[PDB]
Design a protein around this ligand. Structure first.
Ligand code: 26O
Ligand code: 26O
Ligand code: 26O
Ligand code: 26O
Lengths: 810, 810
């Protein structure tokens, strides 16, 4: 049908059809008379998967013969989404499979909906790891993602009575066709025990053993014939574990609980032993696998020339003391040489400045679980602090601030300090975030070792986030500028010469309307809700958190409702306001915010005077597969975090790429987006970082705003009095209380500018032609935010490797 | 190589080879350079499995179109062993695959050893279910085996310091290529809750739900193109189960523990709640599946014409009250009609008379777990006892003996009484066992309903137990009488005309020596032990239990040792005494018996004066795959249970089929074996059932034997004084104590006759020609003990269906 989806040649179509039937018969043991819709999905997944194997075997053989420097991307999260469509896109199979299945009497789109998301992450950090994997493959890098094969990923969210309910995401229930178990690489991981000192070295003894069994998932590059590996460890008890008899077998569950479930904390930090175990487990298994591959290529001097380990936040920070442990205790290297190797091998990416999120592990936990690692951390700290003391003599408070060991009620280890000390590179994830790291939270470390500190602005993969989810837009772009932009996104700049093009303007507006109709349909079928597809689609999708200020969005929505009720017969630009996202199950305020959104909807959506002019919808179960549907449909992207709180954001980049305009604060990557697109082509409002600082110095008094803005006073009074909860008048008292007395994120301080800026959004939407020209200017300058650019910078500036866009032989 | 293994045609060999490579590449993602031995096994299993699918799909389609009466064999145990070789044998593929793999540079025998046994049973009961499945398929019966997919089967046994240690049998660790998950047939099973009464019927409410997910395994008939299904249920939590959050997800393990592990109790009875849950779980899921298939063929009158349910012991006895529950509570049939249907549908096979083995479930357990089932059982019992009371007026003690409800300290339900009341047929498993049922433990029931009581003498499948494990013997037989005996084992009678045949005698003796050399080699490699292959192979393999009298065998062994030590320079027929079997982990006396065997070995095997004349070996980890190796190697089969205690035995039949002579008591099937072969061709010794009864009446005094047999006195004194345990002089005091004061199984009473009979065994072995002629006479009359005969009798006399030996179209 459409060109960017590849060729549907007679040979290939014929061959896909017979392989589909072969799998339906031999693999699924069905015929066309008893086959379920899921059998059909599985037949298709096996047919497509077959096309990966040759390239996968030769890619890995190629790395063995050429022996390049290997990149190990360590993460506790890989938010992959679905694999079927992505595989077809990157193998250029999509049109062929569409034709093959159509001829077999099946709708491929329907089969695609059967696949479960691999929901092995929470949000931006997990999704970033997935985009990175795609880019590393596309750029021909010898890269491996290492993580944990969770049995349960991020919970499925159900909304019951306007409240979030959690249900287990049993994503492996029917089997995962995209994984290959690698039992030959099963590795022991040790826990507890004690440290013994002998004549020559310390020994870690009397440990409990859990086995790590790896499962390999392919990661195809975009049409370059490269297939890299994502290797995820699963926990297994050894066979003599606890070996009255029945209980011993049942107790195997305890050991295997390590890989059972993803922690859904979102940003913040729970010092739970099981989380610590997960962090060590991925680190210990991965490092043994790395060393084994390195020896199979004594001379650890060359280790950093053949290995890079990227630490995705502090979650895998134990790689630093674990590498030291293996080098010093097992390989018998001296400390200083081992340390040299470690620092040159490891690099650290920070993904937050929110203090409550930072990992600070109690000493007593590490003492019991990982006694030798604690001793190594203490030694690291002593040597580091001697370095600080020599550089800044007499500065006693710097010593205590920079310590890896934090003093107090309970002693803790600051894992972020551990990461900086033991890494050759530390990066933030957007220019303003990286500046904040040097200027504030890691200021002392920057002064000691300025050469360590870098920026690597985040990006998204244009494969999943344009070609896959928005083929209609990819196509109209490909019609004018060709197809090479899909792996060289800067080429979108060529679209600037079409901003006055009458044919192109009409096409961009058409694609959007088409996407909006499709999504208005999806809302009807799967959720039985009515929406006007001619309204402005105003969307805020992301995890629920106070700093992201879904609350500020709620305030705007209520303002519009009150304005309509005041002057019912005045024209307003119709809006469909869509807010979606999961709340961490232990996060009370976020759960209350969800309830507020649904309660606003209940009032707004059933007011006869409002009509089709304003609708408020909570998008249930926001996840990667839902993002692929809602983002292409959006007109307005809400990116309204308090300046200084969103490290980068990546949802922002996805909306920009897909033809939505952005209303946002100068925070995270928004700054660089407005910089690329021009400020005139962005709806910027609110306090900058400096204004937030100024207000913090004075003291933030929310009352002042309440006293001076009558429209805001009415909203707070409506909330307090039970306007949005008639049967539970005080339901939202926690919300009013926080906004009035304990708002860390200054919701009221940005309210006036936000509403004003939103009026300007409405003004522009009234003129379709000028709205669309500004959209073209956004799409056209979105090239910088390709994760291909991001990865090329990591490779050249951190890992010391050259990316290649050259094909491997097919 | 050998003819019974089928043809190795050029086309088939070529095709198997390319399918092997195709699977190695596409399925296992390997090439010949990185493939592990296990990859090769899996490639071969996928290649062979492919040949099942056509026949499997058409068999099941055939049952749908012809709609025959379906047989449901319900068992908590299916002791399957390995599947690869059995599949090749029954598909006539064995020689072709041997050639294909040889040409690929691989030894098939080596690949076969990689496969894990499906160890989903304990012993004879579990193995019987497996032989039955094979025969039902071979006989063209529309049969389904239903059970539980245990995550862990029977424990692997390790011997440490002569003591049994248990290790978890994680048989699914690498995936099972022989199962197909059937998620579309996932069914809810209910637990706990309470019973409510409404205007029209009782309702079972407030239950906890566990899901039952079925996995289908093919069961191929012998070269008839029939492939039947074994369907095993797996336990899965529903997704909202327990849904702080982390704990709720981890707690899913509790629900799923139902299908986690096989109870290894062996014969006896532990009233453990988890076992009760397993019993209901298999029953509830299976019955819903049966009814669903029946409706898809309101009119439950025809239910018994289209369904037979065979209850394999009392383990699935809850099928009776569960069927009533569905019929009365859900389908709204009246009691009497529902009961009619139930009785005509269900039949019961008893597999024991040992009182401690009988299931008697405490009322309070059923009350909490299955409240509606308890009410149904009470009602069944009331109606049954009214029947008893009308038939035997005034007989008040008969009423209490026949009650399903047993009175006492704790009230219990006698499940065996439940089974007889609600079944149209009750059978024992050998003629003497079935007689004992009518005469003693079920005497009252026999008097009330004599027409219910039947015999179905056990059998074994000549496919696994001759063709597969002993191809050399199958071949020399096929050379003289053709191949048709493999599915019509009575044809072995034709071998009687070869008993004087000089060529045949030499061949039978050759095959045996070959099997003994092979097994003497296996012992060397895998266990580094030395044995003389020219010695008599004296083997007792079976679970360890006092009634099986491994102890009597031990006494004989010590007698031989003492006789050699007394007269070192006298000739004795050399023996290798092999004893193997697992002990139930909670069975102390059985664990002590194992230690005794190893301790005897330690003394005997290292005595310079003994030499190669006597060796005592404990065969570790006896299981189906080890049986296939040891049985063909055996010369003497030890079947020495106290008369009246072994219901049938089946190991006895396997040894007879494979050219060993039998020394045994007139117990279980031994009686019918000696009857078939002639008593002159069997080494019969010891008390008959009547002699045991006579002794019980008088009082068994072990002292009398000790006082009158000097050779026995010496043994007991050696045991007591620490001759067999120098560092732990009193180690075996529990054993001496039991034999002297508390022996239920009268070991001393059979000692003299046993030793005498054993001397006669040695006498015959000294004359190879006459030993072998007696062997031919055993093989020649073993036809009755084919499970094809057994199943044909179940079908005609219980299920009301005609077996067919006709081929389905290929
Ligand atoms: O089908 C369900 C099962 O599939 C197996 N995968 C196999 S046997 N081969 N996979 C081959 C493969 C081939 C190309 C790309 C990805 C792949 O997983 C997996 O090892 C197993 O965990 C999973 O449950
Ligand atoms: O760089 C990619 C993205 O990283 C996110 N940080 C996240 S999602 N941190 N998550 C931390 C976390 C910590 C413990 C448990 C679950 C979690 O998601 C940042 O908030 C976002 O600005 C940035 O665009
Ligand atoms: O390979 C490992 C996996 O294999 C799957 N089986 C599939 S996808 N097909 N099986 C087809 C089949 C075909 C003929 C005979 C027996 C069979 O299981 C099983 O459903 C799964 O539980 C298992 O872990
Ligand atoms: O009919 C087949 C065989 O059945 C066996 N009975 C067994 S193996 N009962 N097992 C009962 C049992 C009961 C609870 C838990 C585990 C168990 O193996 C009989 O002992 C044997 O004589 C007969 O040949």
């Amino acid at each position: 049908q459409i060109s960017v989806r590849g060729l549907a040649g007679v040979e290939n179509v014929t061959e896909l059809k017979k392989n589909f039937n072969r799998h339906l018969h031999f693999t699924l043991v069905k015929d066309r008379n008893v086959a379920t819709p899921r059998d059909y999905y599985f037949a298709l997944a096996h047919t497509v998967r077959d096309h990966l194997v040759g390239r996968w075997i030769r890619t890995q053989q190629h790395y063995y013969e050429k022996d390049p420097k290997r990149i190990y991307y360590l993460s506790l999260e890989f938010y992959m989404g679905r694999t079927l469509q992505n595989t077809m896109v990157n193998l250029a199979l999509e049109n062929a499979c569409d034709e093959a299945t159509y001829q077999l009497g099946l709708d491929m789109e329907e089969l695609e909906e059967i696949e479960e998301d691999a929901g092995l992450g929470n949000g931006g950090l997990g999704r970033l790891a997935a985009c990175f994997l795609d880019s590393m493959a596309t750029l021909g890098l010898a890269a491996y993602g290492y993580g944990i094969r969770y049995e349960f990923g991020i919970f499925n969210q159900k909304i019951c009575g306007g409240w979030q309910m959690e249900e287990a995401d049993d994503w492996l229930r029917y089997g995962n066709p995209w994984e290959k178990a690698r039992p030959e690489f099963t590795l022991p991981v040790h826990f507890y025990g004690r440290v013994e000192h002998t004549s020559q070295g310390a020994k870690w003894v009397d440990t409990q053993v859990v086995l790590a069994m790896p499962y390999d998932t392919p990661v195809p590059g975009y049409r370059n014939n490269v297939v890299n590996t994502m290797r995820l460890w699963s926990a297994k008890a050894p066979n003599d574990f606890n070996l009255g008899y029945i209980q011993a077998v049942l107790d195997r569950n305890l050991a295997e609980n390590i890989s059972r479930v993803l922690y859904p904390n979102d940003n913040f930090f729970e010092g739970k032993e099981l989380r610590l175990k997960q962090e060590y487990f991925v680190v210990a298994a991965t490092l043994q696998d790395i060393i084994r591959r390195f020896k199979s290529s004594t001379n650890f001097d060359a280790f950093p020339d053949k290995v890079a380990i990227q630490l995705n936040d502090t979650h895998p920070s134990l790689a630093i003391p674990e590498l030291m442990r293996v080098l010093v205790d097992l390989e018998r290297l001296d400390w200083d040489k081992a340390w040299e190797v470690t620092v040159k091998t490891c690099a650290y990416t920070n993904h937050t400045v929110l203090p409550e999120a930072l990992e600070r592990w109690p000493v007593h936990l590490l003492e019991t679980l990982l006694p030798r690692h604690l001793q190594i951390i203490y030694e690291i700290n002593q040597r580091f602090l001697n370095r600080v003391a020599a550089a800044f003599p007499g500065d006693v408070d710097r010593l205590r601030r920079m310590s890896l060991v934090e003093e107090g009620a309970v002693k803790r280890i600051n894992m972020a300090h551990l990461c900086i000390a033991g890494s050759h590179a530390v990066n933030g994830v957007a220019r303003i975030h990286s500046e904040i790291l040097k200027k504030t939270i890691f200021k002392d470390f920057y002064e000691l070792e300025p050469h360590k500190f870098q920026n690597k602005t985040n990006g998204i993969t244009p494969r999943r986030w344009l070609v896959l989810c928005n083929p209609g837009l990819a196509e109209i772009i490909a019609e004018r500028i060709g197809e090479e932009y899909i792996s060289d996104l800067d080429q979108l700049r060529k679209l600037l010469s079409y901003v006055d093009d009458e044919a192109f303007i009409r096409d961009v507006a058409k694609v959007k309307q088409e996407n909006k109709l499709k999504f208005a349909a999806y809302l009807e079928r799967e959720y039985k809700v009515h929406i006007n597809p001619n309204s402005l689609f105003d969307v805020q999708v992301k995890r629920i958190h106070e700093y992201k200020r879904q609350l500020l969005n709620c305030l705007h929505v209520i303002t519009l409702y009150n304005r309509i009720k005041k002057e019912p017969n005045k024209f307003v630009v119709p809006r469909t306001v869509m807010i979606g996202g999961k709340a961490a199950p232990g996060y009370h305020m976020a759960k209350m915010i969800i309830k507020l959104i649904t309660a606003i909807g209940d009032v707004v959506n059933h007011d006869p005077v409002v009509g089709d002019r304003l609708r408020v919808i909570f998008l249930e179960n926001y996840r990667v597969s839902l993002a692929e549907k809602v983002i292409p449909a959006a007109d307005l992207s809400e990116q309204i975090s308090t300046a200084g709180t969103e490290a980068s954001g990546t949802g922002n980049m996805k909306f920009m790429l897909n033809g939505a305009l952005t209303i946002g604060t100068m925070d995270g990557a928004n700054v660089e987006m407005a910089e690329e697109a021009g400020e005139e082509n962005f709806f910027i409002f609110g306090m900058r970082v400096e204004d937030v600082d100024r207000l913090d110095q004075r003291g933030y008094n929310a009352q002042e705003y309440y006293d001076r803005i009558p429209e805001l006073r009415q909203i707070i009074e409506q909330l307090s009095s039970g306007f949005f909860s008639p049967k539970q008048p005080d339901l939202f008292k926690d919300i009013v209380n926080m906004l009035m007395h304990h708002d860390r994120f200054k919701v009221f301080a940005d309210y006036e500018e936000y509403v004003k800026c939103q009026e300007r959004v409405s003004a522009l939407y009234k003129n379709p032609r000028e709205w669309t020209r500004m959209v073209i200017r956004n799409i056209a300058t979105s090239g910088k935010f390709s994760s291909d650019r991001t990865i090329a910078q990591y490779a050249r500036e951190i890992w010391g490797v050259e990316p290649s866009r050259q094909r491997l032989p097919a």
